[PDB]
Design a protein around this ligand. Sequence first.
Ligand SMILES: CCCCCCCCCCCCCC(=O)OC[C@H](COP(=O)(O)OCC[N+](C)(C)C)OC(=O)CCCCCCCCCCCCC
Ligand SMILES: CCCCCCCCCCCCCC(=O)OC[C@H](COP(=O)(O)OCC[N+](C)(C)C)OC(=O)CCCCCCCCCCCCC
Ligand SMILES: CCCCCCCCCCCCCC(=O)OC[C@H](COP(=O)(O)OCC[N+](C)(C)C)OC(=O)CCCCCCCCCCCCC
Ligand SMILES: CCCCCCCCCCCCCC(=O)OC[C@H](COP(=O)(O)OCC[N+](C)(C)C)OC(=O)CCCCCCCCCCCCC
Ligand SMILES: CCCCCCCCCCCCCC(=O)OC[C@H](COP(=O)(O)OCC[N+](C)(C)C)OC(=O)CCCCCCCCCCCCC
Ligand SMILES: CCCCCCCCCCCCCC(=O)OC[C@H](COP(=O)(O)OCC[N+](C)(C)C)OC(=O)CCCCCCCCCCCCC
Ligand SMILES: CCCCCCCCCCCCCC(=O)OC[C@H](COP(=O)(O)OCC[N+](C)(C)C)OC(=O)CCCCCCCCCCCCC
Ligand SMILES: CCCCCCCCCCCCCC(=O)OC[C@H](COP(=O)(O)OCC[N+](C)(C)C)OC(=O)CCCCCCCCCCCCC
Ligand SMILES: CCCCCCCCCCCCO[C@@H]1O[C@H](CO)[C@@H](O[C@H]2O[C@H](CO)[C@@H](O)[C@H](O)[C@H]2O)[C@H](O)[C@H]1O
Ligand SMILES: CCCCCCCCCCCCO[C@@H]1O[C@H](CO)[C@@H](O[C@H]2O[C@H](CO)[C@@H](O)[C@H](O)[C@H]2O)[C@H](O)[C@H]1O
Ligand SMILES: [Ca+2]
Lengths: 218, 218, 218, 218
Amino acid sequence: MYLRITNIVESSFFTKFIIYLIVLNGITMGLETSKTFMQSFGVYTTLFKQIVITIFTIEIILRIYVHRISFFKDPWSLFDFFVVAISLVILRVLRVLRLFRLVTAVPQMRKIVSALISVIPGMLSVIALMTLFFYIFAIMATQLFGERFPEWFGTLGESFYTLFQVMTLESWSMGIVRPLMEVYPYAWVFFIPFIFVVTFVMINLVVAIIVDAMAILN
Amino acid sequence: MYLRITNIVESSFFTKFIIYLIVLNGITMGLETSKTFMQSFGVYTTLFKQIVITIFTIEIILRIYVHRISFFKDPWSLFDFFVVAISLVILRVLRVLRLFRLVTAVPQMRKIVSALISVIPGMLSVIALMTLFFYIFAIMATQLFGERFPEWFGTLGESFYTLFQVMTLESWSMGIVRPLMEVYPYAWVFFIPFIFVVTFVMINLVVAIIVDAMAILN
Amino acid sequence: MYLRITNIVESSFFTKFIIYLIVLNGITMGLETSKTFMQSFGVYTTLFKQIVITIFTIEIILRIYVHRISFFKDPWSLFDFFVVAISLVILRVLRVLRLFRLVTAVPQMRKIVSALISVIPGMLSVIALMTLFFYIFAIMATQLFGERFPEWFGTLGESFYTLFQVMTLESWSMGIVRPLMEVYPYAWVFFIPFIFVVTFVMINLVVAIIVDAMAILN
Amino acid sequence: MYLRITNIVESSFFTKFIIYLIVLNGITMGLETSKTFMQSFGVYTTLFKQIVITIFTIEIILRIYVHRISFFKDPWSLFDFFVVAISLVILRVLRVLRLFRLVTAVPQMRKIVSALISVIPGMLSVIALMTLFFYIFAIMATQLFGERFPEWFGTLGESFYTLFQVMTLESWSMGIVRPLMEVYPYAWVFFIPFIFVVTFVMINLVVAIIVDAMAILN
Ligand SMILES: CCCCCCCCCCCCCC(=O)OC[C@H](COP(=O)(O)OCC[N+](C)(C)C)OC(=O)CCCCCCCCCCCCC
Ligand SMILES: CCCCCCCCCCCCCC(=O)OC[C@H](COP(=O)(O)OCC[N+](C)(C)C)OC(=O)CCCCCCCCCCCCC
Ligand SMILES: CCCCCCCCCCCCCC(=O)OC[C@H](COP(=O)(O)OCC[N+](C)(C)C)OC(=O)CCCCCCCCCCCCC
Ligand SMILES: CCCCCCCCCCCCCC(=O)OC[C@H](COP(=O)(O)OCC[N+](C)(C)C)OC(=O)CCCCCCCCCCCCC
Ligand SMILES: CCCCCCCCCCCCCC(=O)OC[C@H](COP(=O)(O)OCC[N+](C)(C)C)OC(=O)CCCCCCCCCCCCC
Ligand SMILES: CCCCCCCCCCCCCC(=O)OC[C@H](COP(=O)(O)OCC[N+](C)(C)C)OC(=O)CCCCCCCCCCCCC
Ligand SMILES: CCCCCCCCCCCCCC(=O)OC[C@H](COP(=O)(O)OCC[N+](C)(C)C)OC(=O)CCCCCCCCCCCCC
Ligand SMILES: CCCCCCCCCCCCCC(=O)OC[C@H](COP(=O)(O)OCC[N+](C)(C)C)OC(=O)CCCCCCCCCCCCC
Ligand SMILES: CCCCCCCCCCCCO[C@@H]1O[C@H](CO)[C@@H](O[C@H]2O[C@H](CO)[C@@H](O)[C@H](O)[C@H]2O)[C@H](O)[C@H]1O
Ligand SMILES: CCCCCCCCCCCCO[C@@H]1O[C@H](CO)[C@@H](O[C@H]2O[C@H](CO)[C@@H](O)[C@H](O)[C@H]2O)[C@H](O)[C@H]1O
Ligand SMILES: [Ca+2]
């Protein structure tokens, strides 16, 4: 019977049925953002969501019965477990994460996702350096401009936020630095080098990725 | 006579004449955006456009007489057919699409266009993942901020639009997220990871393209 | 004497002296943007500029005496000729172009400039396609939104300008498309595909450059 | 004893202790940006910072005793020396730079930092050209628009700042060039080519980096 349960679990139709259920329920959560739709079919849609979640729970149970410890050493299975647990109870909205199951159920999506994920270890150094950079400048900015510009630099977290904004170049001058220089005429001395460093590091992060990809092909 | 009609259709001067006609008519549609020009020569320009379209129709007819089914299995010919059909009747403006005939008539333009087009199949996976990502976050954003920010997140389509805007980094913070945090102090928890994921995926989309190009050269 | 004049013209000290003169005169044009500096030394600076230009003219004359037709088949010499001619008379400001002589006089600068220039022929196709794209969309935009939005789409040139702005993503939505959709609710149908095409083409332009560079190295 | 002092200085535990001290003191400078934290523990935190700096001084002294001239021919040691000297006395805030010691103390951080630094010599040409470009256009912009737009082009430094802003595409049109064209209708003639050149040069700077990286791998 154990072998029968695993033959049922590992069959192409079992997973195809899962995928079809995921697609239907994604359509449902789309329709659910509509207020008038919920006035007509809110009952039936809530019902459909309840039955979908119980199905996914019973199926996770069966998949655990098939692989005892293998389930919890598997990043994809750990992900499916954790999203269905989240949904089993901000949390109301967080239920929508169960749609990322399409990634773990469809092999094409797994292929591309783990490709992306495997790019990450090679960036671990340049991230740390940039974090340190951000951290240091955040401190400086909070001390240089927090008292007079409390909403952008008044705390370390505000300074982090604004520095991130400056790095994306989003209104860095007309919205942050020119207003500063009305009070601190030499604030560009802080922000131009920052932008320079931040851009140069970003560029190298990208070039590194490219070369590492080439290295695994050649 | 069939062979005579195909010798006429496939000649360098037939296509050169088509190209010259396309260029003249593009000049005409440029001049047509001018109101005072239309006050002096509007009649003659409308006349010229009418005769151009009948010529392109008669020539599509001849090209069909030359290739029976080959015409409709050919992406370039399918394109020429569909644009001249559009123009044969928002539709008034859509007539201007007939200028993309310069691409299908000039071989250099075909070369570069199909180069671009052939880059696309290799991106098909990363597009799907990003779409799913957008779709999920659109739902969440609509539930988190639709009621209080109806013009940016009130519907799924509005949320898609604003999320796309955030991905291009166009006023993401001074125009969207800081206004949000005046009400939802922790909205950055939603948008920073979003930007992070969206940027990282874009970068990999680009690096993939680069390596695939290298793979077809080496 | 001809050989003596060419030995004088082609000597390392002749060009070193030119380079030193260029640097001094660039310093001068920097100091000249200052109004109070011009109140104290405006006379001497104008004098210095006059003598610099006569020197460059006499030296172009000598260089012509050395190479009769070679001078006018040489892109660098053609450039030096044309800038000194511009300065020999908006034109007041255009005199400042003579500082690009540092590029033609210093070999390192020539190396890098012609590297950049030689990247250009390989882009000639993708530029033409994008131009055609811009031209077509400019026409459409002028017809779709010129009457109601005269300052951004009222003419073909205005539409070109605004489309270029949208391509750089500079306020594309908060400043152009959301204001449009207050009147034309479906204007995103025009602008999102535009951005998509424009970005994709830009990306391929860049990837092409990269691969072409690799092709000349391998 | 000299050999004993160098055995103490070069030991893994000496550097591990330095690294732990750096991390603790970074935590401290983070906590120090908080005003209420300083009301409760400001005394103890200032005390901790004092003892940290004396420790780093005594340790730099020992490291000098170990390597006489080697210390001052070493870029990392020169950096540690210069930051601790800065902190030994705007300067109040500049003390925070001592956190970049984590880079010089951790080998992973040294690896990635010198990787970045070694990318730089290959860019030295394209930087100079771009600087010259900026300098020339700064002069022109100051003469074309300084009198009427004193806050953006009134001086050479203001023009540099605004040109840099335009290069990052940060409000280049809605904030700079459209306001200009209300007065100088043809100002786009200046700024579009500028953007074009500036973008093209940036792209080549990046492509160069990529190919140079490939050249050192193949
Ligand atoms: C895939 C491999 C790993 C990739 C992971 C990337 C790691 C990112 C590092 C983030 C480090 C955490 C920074 C941090 O402590 O943030 C704290 C702040 C606190 O927010 P808060 O003070 O509440 O915000 C102000 C809100 N307001 C106006 C309503 C008062 O919250 C914020 O302000 C958010 C700040 C975002 C800054 C992001 C820093 C990025 C550093 C470089 C990232 C990598 C670049 C390649
Ligand atoms: C390598 C660098 C890693 C960087 C990781 C950063 C992660 C932690 C950063 C978190 C930033 C949060 C900033 C923030 O929220 O500011 C608020 C607090 C205190 O502000 P304050 O308003 O005084 O609190 C009183 C409460 N109130 C509102 C009722 C008056 O302000 C604070 O409490 C700030 C506390 C800072 C903790 C520092 C963590 C440092 C990690 C180790 C770094 C080592 C680098 C060498
Ligand atoms: C060449 C290979 C294939 C490439 C194809 C790329 C595929 C793009 C996926 C788009 C999926 C469709 C999204 C969608 O359903 O859009 C619906 C909304 C409805 O508009 P609507 O609700 O009328 O807009 C609000 C207007 N207002 C203010 C007047 C009320 O209309 C919008 O808001 C437009 C939303 C645009 C979002 C674009 C999503 C991009 C996903 C990632 C794209 C690939 C990145 C590499
Ligand atoms: C993998 C993901 C693919 C994503 C493709 C997305 C393409 C479809 C998205 C279209 C978004 C359109 C949003 C929109 O226009 O909102 C309006 C409607 C209903 O709003 P509402 O205002 O209640 O309608 C009443 C009419 N009124 C104005 C007179 C009161 O709101 C709706 O009707 C929204 C309907 C959502 C349809 C969902 C399509 C899902 C495709 C399958 C996704 C599977 C993922 C696992
Ligand atoms: C190195 C190899 C060659 C590279 C060369 C690049 C070629 C660029 C193509 C430009 C084609 C010319 C477009 C054109 O006709 O522009 C006319 C307009 C007329 O200006 P106007 O109507 O006076 O402007 C409105 C001013 N206002 C508010 C005071 C009334 O003036 C403008 O609005 C300027 C429009 C700029 C549009 C740029 C079009 C770029 C197409 C794609 C470029 C290549 C991308 C890779
Ligand atoms: C492949 C495509 C290449 C694209 C190259 C584009 C270069 C030419 C575009 C120039 C755009 C200039 C737009 C412009 O300034 O608009 C003003 C004029 C007439 O406007 P309007 O206000 O009626 O003039 C009356 C004067 N006024 C103010 C006292 C009332 O409006 C015009 O006169 C527009 C004239 C359009 C000339 C079209 C040139 C087309 C080149 C061939 C394209 C073939 C493509 C198949
Ligand atoms: C790693 C290898 C080496 C990399 C080093 C990069 C070299 C950067 C070159 C910078 C050259 C110096 C330019 C300069 O003289 O700046 C002077 C201005 C004077 O500021 P000031 O007149 O006080 O600013 C106006 C402030 N206000 C409103 C309160 C009155 O201050 C500014 O406005 C700052 C201007 C920033 C312009 C940056 C120029 C970048 C050129 C291209 C950079 C390389 C691109 C790849
Ligand atoms: C290859 C190019 C390298 C570029 C490196 C640029 C580094 C130097 C640029 C510094 C820009 C500073 C601009 C600036 O602050 O403007 C103020 C001054 C004088 O303005 P002004 O307001 O008249 O001064 C009177 C004082 N006040 C306020 C009480 C009335 O305005 C000035 O004093 C400007 C002085 C310009 C010095 C030019 C340095 C040129 C380096 C050599 C370039 C050779 C290129 C061929
Ligand atoms: C793959 C990675 C996935 C990343 C997923 C990230 C999801 C994280 C969502 C963060 C959401 C933040 O948005 C959060 O919305 C809720 C909605 O009740 C607000 O909650 C509350 O806000 C204020 C509190 O006085 C009131 O208006 C109200 O009582 C309530 O709405 C939070 O204050 C806001 O900050
Ligand atoms: C390597 C490539 C180099 C590219 C170089 C590009 C340089 C081109 C410079 C374009 C300058 C445009 O800037 C131009 O400035 C002059 C200054 O008198 C203005 O000229 C005039 O404007 C109006 C006209 O009623 C009045 O204020 C005044 O009579 C006068 O100033 C132009 O209207 C403006 O459009
Ligand atoms: Ca912007």
